[PDB]
Amino acid sequence: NLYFQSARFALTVVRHGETRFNKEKIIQGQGVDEPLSETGFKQAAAAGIFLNNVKFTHAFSSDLMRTKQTMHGILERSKFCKDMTVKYDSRLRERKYGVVEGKALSELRAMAKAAREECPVFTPPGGETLDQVKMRGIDFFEFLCQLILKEADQKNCLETSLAEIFPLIPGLAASVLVVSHGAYMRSLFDYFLTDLKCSLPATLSRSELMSVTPNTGMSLFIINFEEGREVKPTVQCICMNLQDHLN
Could you tell me the CA-to-CA distances from 35 to 165, 181, 211, 234 in Å, in that order? 28, 13, 24, 36
The answer to whether 7 and 149 have CB atoms below 8 angstroms apart is: yes
The answer to whether residue 230 is catalytic is: no
| β-strands 7-15, 218-225 pairing | antiparallel
Catalytic residue among 18, 94, 101, 128: 94
CATH number at residue 224: 3.40.50.1240
Domain membership of residue 33 as a residue range: 1-247
Instruction: Give this entry's resolution in angstroms.
Output: 1.7
| PDB experimental method | X-ray
Q: At what angle do helices 65-75 and 38-50 cross, to 10 degrees?
A: 40
The answer to whether residue 118 is catalytic is: no
Q: How many domains does the chain have?
A: 1
